[PDB]
């Protein structure tokens, strides 16, 4: 008849109806009542006279702050009583003493700060008690003394600081005890005395500085947890008095040294996880324990694994031994249940074929960051299914393929010196692979293609034609300049020097074309051979030297023109010194990429500025900046002739050559700064072709612009023809 609901099986629910007092008019024969989420501030004297047959009473969240001592009188049959989330500042000592048949009492989520001495007296049948999320400052020893029949006590989220001796002496029937999230610092010697039936003990999130010696008085423990504490040592035989332990939570602590035989004779332990125990040297002497499924030891100084590991631990499934100093590996035969093996960041230096022999149910293997130097061919043959296998960052000259046809994810990152490549005919199921060297995955782009160096027929033809023309023109010009006379004018010397310098670029282009021809349809295999071999570095150095020599020759010509237009100095010795020092500057520029490592090997083209930002940002940017800035001095020098557009005799060809060289250099030089300016993006193949074409053009052009635009060329040819006649 009440505004709240009802139930057929003598149950009444009135949660969340906003009641201020207990509901009236209900049936006298009521077995359960719920008044949880109403706003009731007090229970009067005669509150529950109309419900003599109550068995369950709920008042959670009522904002209840007063209980009359006679309010619960007459509820002799009451069995369950909940009062959580109310504002009871203290345990209701007087109110609840009349509940002879009470079995469950919830008082958590309150602001309890004091417990009267005579509290809980007369509660003979009590079996469960909640006191969580309160402001308790010490264990209520005497109030608990009146509850010999208690079966589950929890005192979490309080401010307990220390537990005195014989605190729970009379609670011989207790089987569950929670004490986590307290500020407990010290446990007395006999605090847990008399808890012979306890099965779970929770001590997480406390501030224990030393391992609790009291747990030696618990003979029936099955679950123990003391993580998030400040414990640093488990001295020896700490769990000697707990043969039945199954689960231990100790994985968040400043652990530094666990005893050699700390975990010993624990025949029912399931999981053993130890992290950061640096001082540990030997393997844990875990004899007797033969029921392990996970064994994880990390951050220690373990130097060896015992041969008897899983011939004893036949149930072992996960074995994590990362970090540490494991140098040798004992044969893992008998490890029939091993699913995951982790050995990353160790001193393992080889895997003989007898190491991983005999494993069937293996699923994941980890060997990253080790020093594995060699693996025998059949070392991987014997294992069954494999899904992961990491050998990243080791010294593997060769890697066998037999027995990895079922492999799914493979990781060899950083395995430099692993030159000889894999093949898809054995590795069939992989769709996850990362390899050292470069373009090892061309069998399974646009920068180091496995097909050919160039690929585009037009690009290769243009490169071959440019190389041949540049070679012929440079040879003819050099021969003519050298045979012209015993003495060469400054302009003639500069022209001869430029023609000689173009020879470096011509030879580099010829070498690149020959490599592409050899790599036609097979470049991949050659690729690494080029990168590892001195050929690519030599080609890159030659290209850099040719560019530097061309820049130096242009600068020398500009300086001579400026001196002529400003003065005459006639410093032939100075000109020879500058010509000689141009070679020294080019050598210094080339050695700049040689002192650093990994510069020329970045790409098969050997270009100083490959795709992406150059790791040697300093020198790479400085060289381009100097090359660009030289144009400012060149323009400042040439402005005198530009304003009148000496150029009277032959400067016309020189100016055009300088302008063409500057224009060709500008795109390649700007491409080196593309990574800094994200607004500009270039495709890999297109960028490669553009760089290749820009590089040869100055050498392809300059001899033609000199001979084809200088009548002095024909004059010298005719004069030197006398040597032929």
């Amino acid at each position, epitope marked *: 008849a009440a505004p709240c609901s009802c139930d057929g099986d003598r149950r009444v629910d009135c949660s969340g109806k906003g009641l201020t007092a207990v509901p009236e008019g209900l049936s006298a024969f009521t077995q359960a009542l719920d008044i949880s989420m109403n706003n009731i*501030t007090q229970l009067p004297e005669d509150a529950f006279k109309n419900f003599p047959f109550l068995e369950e009473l709920q008042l959670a969240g009522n904002d209840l*702050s*007063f*209980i*009359h*001592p006679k309010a619960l009188s007459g509820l002799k049959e009451l069995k369950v009583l909940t009062l959580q989330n109310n*504002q*009871l*500042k*203290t*345990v*209701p*000592s*007087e*109110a609840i003493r009349g509940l002879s048949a009470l079995q469950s009492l919830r008082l958590d989520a309150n602001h309890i700060t*004091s417990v*009267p*001495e*005579d*509290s809980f*007296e007369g509660l003979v049948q009590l079996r469960h008690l909640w006191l969580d999320d309160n402001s308790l400052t010490e264990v209520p020893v005497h109030p608990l003394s009146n509850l010999p029949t208690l079966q589950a006590l929890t005192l979490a989220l309080n401010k307990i600081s220390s537990i005195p001796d014989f605190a729970f002496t009379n609670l011989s029937s207790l089987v569950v005890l929670h004490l986590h999230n307290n500020k407990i610092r010290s446990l007395s010697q006999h605090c847990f005395d008399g808890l012979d039936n306890l099965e779970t003990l929770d001590l997480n999130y406390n501030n224990l500085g030393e391992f609790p010696q009291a747990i030696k008085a618990l003979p029936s423990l099955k679950e123990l947890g003391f993580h998030s504490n400040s414990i640093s040592v488990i001295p020896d035989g700490a769990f000697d008095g707990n043969p039945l332990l199954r689960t231990i939570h100790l994985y968040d602590n400043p652990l530094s040294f666990v005893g050699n035989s700390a975990f010993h004779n624990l025949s029912d332990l399931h999981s053993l996880v130890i992290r950061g125990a640096s001082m540990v040297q030997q393997f844990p002497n875990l004899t007797g324990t033969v029921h392990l499924e996970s064994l994880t030891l990390t951050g220690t100084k373990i130097s060896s694994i015992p041969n008897n590991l899983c011939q004893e631990q036949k149930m072992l499934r996960t074995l994590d031994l990362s970090y540490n100093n494991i140098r040798d590996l004992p044969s893992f035969n008998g490890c029939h249940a091993l699913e995951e093996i982790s050995l990353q960041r160790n001193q393992i230096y080889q895997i003989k074929e007898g190491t991983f022999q005999g494993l069937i149910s293996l699923r994941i293997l980890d060997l990253s960051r080790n020093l594995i130097h060699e693996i025998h061919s059949r070392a991987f043959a014997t294992l069954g299914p494999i899904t992961n296998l990491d050998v990243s960052f080791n010294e593997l000259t060769s890697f066998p393929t037999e027995g990895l046809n079922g492999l799914n994810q493979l990781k060899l990152v950083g395995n430099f010196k692993l030159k000889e490549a894999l093949a898809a005919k054995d590795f069939v199921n992989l769709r996850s692979l990362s390899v050292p060297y470069a373009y090892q995955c061309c069998a399974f782009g646009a920068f180091k293609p496995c097909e050919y160096l160039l690929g585009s027929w037009m690009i290769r033809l243009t490169v071959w034609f440019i190389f041949l023309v540049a070679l012929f023109f440079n040879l003819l010009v050099i021969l003519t300049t050298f045979a012209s006379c015993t003495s060469l004018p400054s302009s003639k010397l500069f022209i001869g020097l430029i023609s000689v310098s173009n020879l470096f670029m011509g030879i580099y282009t010829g070498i690149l074309t020959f490599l592409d021809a050899v790599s036609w349809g097979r470049f991949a295999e050659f690729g690494i051979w080029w990168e590892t071999g001195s050929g690519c570095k030599v080609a890159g150095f030659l290209a850099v030297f040719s560019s530097e020599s061309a820049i130096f020759l242009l600068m020398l010509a500009t300086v001579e023109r400026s001196l002529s237009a400003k003065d005459k100095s006639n410093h032939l010795k100075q000109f020879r010194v500058a010509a000689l020092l141009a070679f020294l500057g080019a050598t210094v520029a080339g050695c700049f990429p040689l002192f650093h490592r990994g510069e020329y090997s970045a790409s098969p083209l050997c270009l100083p500025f490959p795709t992406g930002e150059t790791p040697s940002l300093g020198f790479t940017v400085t060289l381009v900046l100097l090359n660009s800035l030289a144009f400012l001095l060149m323009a400042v020098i040439y402005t005198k002739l530009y304003c009148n557009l000496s150029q009277s005799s032959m400067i016309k060809h020189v100016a055009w050559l300088i302008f063409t060289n500057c224009i060709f250099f500008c795109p390649v030089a700007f491409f080196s700064f593309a990574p800094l300016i994200t607004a500009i993006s270039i495709s890999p193949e297109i960028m490669k072709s553009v760089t290749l074409i820009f590089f040869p053009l100055p050498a392809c052009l300059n001899p033609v612009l000199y001979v084809f635009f200088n009548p002095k060329f024909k004059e010298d040819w005719k004069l030197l023809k006398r040597r032929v006649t």
Partner: nanobody
Amino acid sequence: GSLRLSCAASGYTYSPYCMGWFRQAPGKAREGVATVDLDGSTIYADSVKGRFTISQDNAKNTLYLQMNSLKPEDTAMYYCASRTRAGVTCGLNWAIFSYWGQGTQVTVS
């Protein structure tokens, strides 16, 4: 105001173990005012330390609480409470008392 807040115990006469005065603001919890045990030891609340004074006439069970210079915060309903057995320490805890009175009103304006 010379406000005498008297009490009277009508059940039994022989000195109960502890007798206190408490107060309640409308709708809030019961917090103590004063307590006195069989030996005559006396306890007061911090807000009550000086203004009030708890007394007793044991032979007659008339137990007064004297209030003077009442603060405006002192508007509440006051309860006289008692306890018989000795199995607790005396203090301003509402959960230890066994018998509670109907209380009265004191409106300080």
